[PDB]
């Protein structure tokens, strides 16, 4: 594979490498953005969980996971993909919802059949409450609610870690009506629902953002390794290069000397 | 002869590469051991010996010169080639041209990054120098950040500027075939860009500007142009004058 | 005291701050949130958050919607979809919006249409409250 | 190199010990996509061999294709079935690692020799993914598959 | 260079030469007449070239490209020879500027060509090494001074082994 071939390699590898880094920075920048943006959200979403945090719910019975639209980031997908399915046997009203598609693309195998809806774009457009509401909204209209809903998302923790986290989504007012939850409110299975609602969006937003944050750092990370990887490989080729490089010459010189010791 | 007649001559050797072949051929026919790639040993020496004869003399000779433009033509994606190697060591910088930019339409299409004048400033005008130092710089970083031409949106504005600016400058170094210029004009157009008036403008209009502007200054600021032609530097007066011209012109041009 | 967490997606206005009381426009209507709290859930309407911060000072906002979360805890959580200080809203515009709203209503003729329009009316009007 | 190149013509069984593999530590160090035998045939040595192999040869062949993309990418965002298979291919690789009775001094390891059936069996099993819930290194320097099993326990 | 590589060199030339009473040799190996010309003027300029007293710290030897390679091939040896003079005789701890020895090497290779020799790899002169050994081994510290080399080296094709 002449030097040429090799150059095809090299050339592109530089590019890749370069790209990785470029893209890295790019990613990292986004990642930074997500981080800041995560702040109010943290509060807010932690807020979302308020009630629930102050209140256990149950059902004998919306399993949904949260992923990014795209890969080329960590094992975000893998996790969720995994852990939704990991669940999925246990429960009645088995039905799944996937937000993002790097879960649609892995959890699709038979989730081609067990998804309820699936949502496209997540990252590559930073998440918003606005959005959160959207996906939330139609989600409601559907006779799937809780089989006990759970929400699977990537809880960012640090650039070194995120945890695909999950919470359960009580998508029923009703048992919230029941229980001691009865008097955690002391004010209507109406507004309940309109909180059940709202918190689904809040969390959705939240989740979305965590997910993406986690992702963005993972992509950033991802770009880091790769580009290093790239670097060593270049090096290896470079030997192969010269060597062969000379080899040519050599062979050729050979051919010269020989052909000059053996011309007509 | 010119050189010794104080005079300055320009020889374009277009090209030693083909010569080398011929010579090699000649050598070989001479049944002589040639060298690398079957090419002779002294094809450098020959030429070194030739090329050293292209020079700028002392004053004793009327200071004369023979300015040499040897050509060695890119080896279709290579220049590692022997003769280039040689020549690389010989010439007083080298102008790497790459097609691609040409193909981009970016004409001229130089591989500037590699291009070198091992000289530089003695071969300059302050006018140019005053800006050119900076220009070089602007390109340098720009090249560095051109690295990440893909986007840079997702990164900082400064550098986004540098990219835009850079791209703009590119337009400034662009030139058509049968389109050479003279110096004041050249600096003139650079000034605009270097004063970043055109960042708002897009590359297409740079060119557009430039002509128009050029023809404009030619008209009005012909006054000024006489002076600049004179001045060898850029003059404070001229700067302002230029600027004002430019700003106004610019304003019209963009409008 | 009540630890008031007043936040919107965008920001946290009060964060478990010992605010004495906050008056909110739950969809219940008005409501005077005091230092400790009922376990109660409330829905937010377009009206004002007046955050009687335990210091006399009270900040105003108009909040469109969201939830106040009324804990058994003295922790109160206003999670306003958006609650903004009126500061960033404009009266002139409000009028214009309301006008439109009112204009629109007249052709709002599916219940939903009416309703949304009505949201606008109601809303826009409710901005006028404090604008 | 022309010399071997010629040589091949005369071969009937080619043994390529593969330094790459050797670098993978393995002794056995062969690469059978290289080490081939004219007499390796569905013919001469059964198709089982061939096929079990073809799957292997394949899987490896594919894998061989993969390692390089993976070299950059890892297999991370690259299909799990592949992940499985890759690992399997590798396991199979590992399972091929076989102690040297002679060079127990050299290896430490104590030689293994495996009659055909257990050979077949081995791959067929690994191929069955039956094994795969297991560690790669379990397959390392085994004797028959049992020994891998034994080793699995010994691992986990 | 033009960084003031050469300058740095000049400064160095100065420093040792100064500080130890040492001295320098400039061996313009396959020298670009042009650069040596330029350079010349720089030393003159720098005044390290002393001309009133030619008690510059350096004897300059230039062996330009334009000279026949055969000639060029030797100039280091020459330099060496002088430096031995200076070393032993003049007690000196010479600095040997060899510029660019790679071009020497190159010249050697050319030389080889003409000499019709079977040469080292890539056609490189065979005896590159042997030449080097005796020479490099000539460069040393006696016990009368030292010929210490500063070698400008161009790494051909930036390729090294």
From Swiss-Prot, chain A:
Compartments (UniProt record): Mitochondrion inner membrane
Membrane topology field: Peripheral membrane protein
Subunit structure: Component of the ATP synthase complex composed at least of ATP5F1A/subunit alpha, ATP5F1B/subunit beta, ATP5MC1/subunit c (homooctomer), MT-ATP6/subunit a, MT-ATP8/subunit 8, ATP5ME/subunit e, ATP5MF/subunit f, ATP5MG/subunit g, ATP5MK/subunit k, ATP5MJ/subunit j, ATP5F1C/subunit gamma, ATP5F1D/subunit delta, ATP5F1E/subunit epsilon, ATP5PF/subunit F6, ATP5PB/subunit b, ATP5PD/subunit d, ATP5PO/subunit OSCP.
Protein name as catalogued: ATP synthase F(1) complex subunit gamma, mitochondrial
Residues recorded as bearing N6-succinyllysine in the entry: 24, 85, 120, 236
InterPro entries given in the database record: ATP_synth_F1_ATPase_gsu, ATP_synth_F1_gsu, ATP_synth_F1_gsu_CS
N6-acetyllysine PTM sites in chain numbering: 14, 30, 85, 120, 163
GO molecular function: proton-transporting ATP synthase activity, rotational mechanism
Keyword Ribonucleoprotein: no
Main location: mitochondrion
The keyword rRNA-binding belongs to this UniProt entry's keyword annotation: no
Pfam families the record matches: ATP-synt
Biological processes annotated in GO: proton motive force-driven ATP synthesis; proton motive force-driven mitochondrial ATP synthesis
PANTHER family: ATP SYNTHASE GAMMA CHAIN, ATP SYNTHASE SUBUNIT GAMMA, MITOCHONDRIAL
Residue numbers bearing the Phosphoserine modification: 112
Keywords: Acetylation, ATP synthesis, CF(1), Hydrogen ion transport, Ion transport, Membrane, Mitochondrion, Mitochondrion inner membrane, Phosphoprotein, Transit peptide, Transport
Family under the similarity heading: Belongs to the ATPase gamma chain family.
Curated annotation (Swiss-Prot), chain B:
Site entry: Required for activity: 115
Protein name: ATP synthase F(1) complex subunit alpha, mitochondrial
Subunit and interaction comment: Homotrimer. Component of the ATP synthase complex composed at least of ATP5F1A/subunit alpha, ATP5F1B/subunit beta, ATP5MC1/subunit c (homooctomer), MT-ATP6/subunit a, MT-ATP8/subunit 8, ATP5ME/subunit e, ATP5MF/subunit f, ATP5MG/subunit g, ATP5MK/subunit k, ATP5MJ/subunit j, ATP5F1C/subunit gamma, ATP5F1D/subunit delta, ATP5F1E/subunit epsilon, ATP5PF/subunit F6, ATP5PB/subunit b, ATP5PD/subunit d, ATP5PO/subunit OSCP.
Residue list for modification N6-succinyllysine: 7, 129, 200, 208, 233, 241
Residues that, per the record, bind Mg(2+): 14
Tissues in which the UniProt entry reports expression: Heart muscle (at protein level). Heart and liver.
Region of the whole protein represented: 299 to 553 of 553
Anything else known: The siderophore enterobactin (Ent) produced by enteric bacteria binds Fe(3+) and helps bacteria scavenge iron ions from the environment. As a consequence, the mammalian siderocalin LCN2 plays an important role in defense against bacterial infections by sequestering iron bound to microbial siderophores. LCN2 can also bind iron bound to endogenous or nutrient-derived iron chelators and plays an important role in cellular iron homeostasis.
Protein source organism: Bos taurus
Localization of this protein: Mitochondrion inner membrane; Cell membrane
Curated annotation (Swiss-Prot), chain C:
UniProt KW keywords: Acetylation, ATP synthesis, CF(1), Hydrogen ion transport, Ion transport, Membrane, Mitochondrion, Mitochondrion inner membrane, Transit peptide, Transport
Record-level GO cellular component terms: mitochondrial envelope; mitochondrial inner membrane; mitochondrion; proton-transporting ATP synthase complex
N6-succinyllysine found at: 100, 129
Ion transport in keyword set: yes
Any one biological process term the GO annotation gives: proton transmembrane transport
Record carries keyword Transport: yes
Compartments, record wording: Mitochondrion; Mitochondrion inner membrane
Organism domain of life: Eukaryota
Quaternary structure annotation from Swiss-Prot or TrEMBL: Component of the ATP synthase complex composed at least of ATP5F1A/subunit alpha, ATP5F1B/subunit beta, ATP5MC1/subunit c (homooctomer), MT-ATP6/subunit a, MT-ATP8/subunit 8, ATP5ME/subunit e, ATP5MF/subunit f, ATP5MG/subunit g, ATP5MK/subunit k, ATP5MJ/subunit j, ATP5F1C/subunit gamma, ATP5F1D/subunit delta, ATP5F1E/subunit epsilon, ATP5PF/subunit F6, ATP5PB/subunit b, ATP5PD/subunit d, ATP5PO/subunit OSCP.
Family according to the record: Belongs to the ATPase epsilon chain family.
Name of this protein: ATP synthase F(1) complex subunit delta, mitochondrial
Provenance organism: Bos taurus (Bovine)
Range covered out of full length: 37 to 167 of 168
UniProtKB/Swiss-Prot annotation, chain E:
Annotated positions of the N6-succinyllysine modification: 52, 57
GO terms under biological process: proton motive force-driven ATP synthesis; proton motive force-driven mitochondrial ATP synthesis
Residues given in the record as ATP binding sites: 2, 4-7, 32
Positions that bind Mg(2+) 1: 6
Modified positions (Phosphothreonine) in chain numbering: 105
Residues the record lists as binding Mg(2+) 2: 31
GO MF term (any one): ATP hydrolysis activity
Binding site for ADP: 2-7
Binding positions (phosphate): 2-6
Subcellular location: Mitochondrion inner membrane
Cysteines joined through disulfide linkages: none
Predominant location category: mitochondrion
Keyword list, A-Z: Acetylation, ATP synthesis, ATP-binding, CF(1), Glycoprotein, Hydrogen ion transport, Ion transport, Magnesium, Membrane, Metal-binding, Mitochondrion, Mitochondrion inner membrane, Nucleotide-binding, Phosphoprotein, Transit peptide, Translocase, Transport
CC annotations in GO: mitochondrial inner membrane; mitochondrion; proton-transporting ATP synthase complex
Chain positions found as N6-acetyllysine: 52, 57
Family to which the UniProt record says this protein belongs: Belongs to the ATPase alpha/beta chains family.
Function of the molecule: Catalytic subunit beta, of the mitochondrial membrane ATP synthase complex (F(1)F(0) ATP synthase or Complex V) that produces ATP from ADP in the presence of a proton gradient across the membrane which is generated by electron transport complexes of the respiratory chain. ATP synthase complex consist of a soluble F(1) head domain - the catalytic core - and a membrane F(1) domain - the membrane proton channel. These two domains are linked by a central stalk rotating inside the F(1) region and a stationary peripheral stalk.
Protein name, UniProt field: ATP synthase F(1) complex catalytic subunit beta, mitochondrial
Taxonomic source organism: Bos taurus (Bovine)
Organism placement in taxonomy: Eukaryota, Metazoa, Chordata, Craniata, Vertebrata
């Amino acid at each position: 594979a002449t030097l040429k071939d090799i150059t095809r390699r090299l050339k592109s590898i530089k590019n890749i490498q370069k790209i990785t880094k470029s893209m890295k920075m790019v990613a990292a920048a986004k990642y930074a953005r997500a981080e800041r943006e995560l702040k109010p959200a943290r509060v807010y979403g932690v807020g979302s969980l308020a009630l629930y945090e102050k209140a256990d719910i149950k059902t004998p019975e919306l399993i949904i996971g949260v992923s990014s639209d795209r890969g080329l980031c960590g094992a975000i997908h893998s996790s969720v993909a995994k852990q939704m399915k990991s669940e999925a046997a246990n429960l009645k009203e088995v039905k799944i919802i996937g937000v993002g598609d790097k879960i649609r693309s892995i959890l699709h195998r038979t989730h081609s059949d067990q998804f309820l809806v699936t949502f496209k774009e997540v990252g590559r457009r930073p998440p918003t409450f606005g959005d959160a509401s959207v996906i939330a909204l139609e989600l409601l209209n559907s006779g799937y609610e809780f089989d006990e809903g759970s929400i699977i998302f990537n809880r960012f923790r640090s650039v070194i870690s995120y945890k695909t986290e999950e919470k359960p989504i009580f998508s029923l007012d009703t048992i919230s009506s029941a229980e001691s939850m009865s008097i955690y409110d002391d004010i209507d299975a109406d507004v309940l629902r309109n909180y059940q609602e709202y918190s689904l969006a809040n969390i959705i937003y939240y989740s979305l953002k965590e997910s993406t944050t986690s992702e963005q750092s993972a992509r950033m990370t991802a770009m880091d390794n790769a580009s290093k990887n790239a670097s060593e490989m270049i090096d290896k080729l470079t030997l192969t290069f010269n060597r062969t490089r000379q080899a040519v010459i050599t062979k050729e010189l050979i051919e010269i000397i020989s052909g000059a010791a053996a011309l007509d | 002869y010119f050189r010794d007649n104080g005079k300055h001559a320009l020889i374009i050797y277009d090209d030693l590469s083909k010569q080398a072949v011929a010579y090699r051929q000649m050598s070989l026919l001479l049944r002589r051991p040639p060298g690398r790639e079957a090419y002779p040993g002294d094809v450098f020496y020959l030429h070194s010996r030739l090329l050293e004869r292209a020079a700028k003399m002392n004053d004793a000779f009327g200071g004369g010169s023979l300015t040499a433009l040897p050509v060695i033509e890119t080896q279709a994606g290579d220049v590692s080639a022997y003769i280039p190697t040689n020549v690389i060591s010989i010439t007083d910088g080298q102008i790497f041209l790459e097609t691609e930019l040409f193909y981009k339409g970016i004409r001229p299409a130089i591989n500037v990054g590699l291009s070198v004048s091992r000289v530089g400033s003695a071969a300059q005008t302050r006018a140019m120098k005053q800006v050119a130092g900076t220009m070089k710089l602007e390109l340098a970083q720009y090249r560095e950040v051109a690295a990440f031409a893909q986007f840079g949106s997702d990164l900082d504005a400064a550098t986004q500027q540098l990219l835009s600016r850079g791209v703009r400058l590119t337009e400034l170094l662009k030139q058509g075939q049968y389109s050479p210029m003279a110096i004041e004009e050249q600096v003139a157009v650079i000034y605009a860009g270097v004063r970043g008036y055109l960042d708002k403008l897009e590359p297409s209009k740079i060119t557009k500007f430039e002509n128009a502007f050029l023809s404009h200054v030619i008209s009005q600021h012909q006054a000024l142009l006489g002076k600049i032609r004179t001045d060898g530097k850029i003059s404070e007066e001229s700067d302002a004058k230029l600027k004002e011209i430019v700003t106004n012109f610019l304003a019209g041009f963009e409008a | 005291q009540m630890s008031f967490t007043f936040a919107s997606p965008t920001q946290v206005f009060f964060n478990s701050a010992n605010v004495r009381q906050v008056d909110v426009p739950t969809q219940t209507g008005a409501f005077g949130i005091l230092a400790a709290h009922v376990p109660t859930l409330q829905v937010l309407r377009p009206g004002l958050v007046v955050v009687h911060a335990e210091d006399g000072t009270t900040s105003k906002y108009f909040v469109s919607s969201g939830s106040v979360t009324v804990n058994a805890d003295s922790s109160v959580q206003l999670l306003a979809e958006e609650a903004v200080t009126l500061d960033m809203l404009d009266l002139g515009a409000a009028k214009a919006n309301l006008e439109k709203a009112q204009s629109e209503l007249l052709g709002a003729a599916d219940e939903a249409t009416r309703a949304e329009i009505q949201i606008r009316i109601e809303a826009n009007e409710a901005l006028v409250k404090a604008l | 190199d022309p010399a071997p190149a010629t040589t091949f013509a005369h071969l009937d069984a080619t043994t390529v010990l593969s330094r790459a593999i050797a670098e993978l530590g393995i002794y056995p160090a062969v690469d059978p996509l290289d080490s081939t035998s004219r007499i390796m045939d569905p013919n001469i040595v059964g198709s089982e061999h061939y096929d079990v192999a073809r799957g292997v040869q394949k899987i490896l062949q594919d894998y061989k294709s993969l390692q390089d993309i993976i070299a950059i990418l890892g297999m991370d965002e690259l299909s799990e079935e592949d992940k499985l298979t890759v690992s399997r291919a590798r396991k199979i690789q590992r399972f091929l690692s076989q102690p040297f009775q002679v060079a127990e001094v050299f290896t430490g390891h104590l030689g293994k020799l495996v009659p055909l059936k257990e050979t077949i069996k081995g791959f067929q099993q690994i191929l069955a993914g039956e094994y795969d819930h297991l560690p790669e290194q379990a397959f390392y320097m085994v004797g028959p598959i049992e020994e891998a099993v034994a080793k699995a326990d010994k691992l986990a | 260079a033009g960084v003031g590589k050469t300058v740095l060199i000049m400064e160095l030339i100065n420093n040792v030469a100064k500080a130890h009473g040492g001295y320098s040799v400039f061996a313009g190996v396959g020298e670009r007449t042009r650069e040596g010309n330029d350079l010349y003027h720089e030393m003159i300029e720098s005044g390290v070239i002393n001309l009133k007293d030619a008690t510059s710290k350096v004897a300059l030897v230039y062996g330009q490209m334009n000279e026949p390679p055969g000639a060029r091939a030797r100039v280091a040896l020459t330099g060496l020879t002088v430096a031995e003079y200076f070393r032993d005789q003049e007690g000196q701890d010479v600095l040997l500027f060899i510029d660019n020895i790679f071009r020497f090497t190159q010249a050697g290779s050319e030389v080889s060509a003409l000499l019709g020799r079977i040469p080292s790899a890539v056609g490189y002169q065979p005896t590159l090494a042997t030449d080097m050994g005796t020479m490099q081994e000539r460069i040393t510290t006696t016990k009368k001074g030292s010929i210490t080399s500063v070698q400008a080296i161009y790494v051909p094709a930036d390729d090294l082994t």
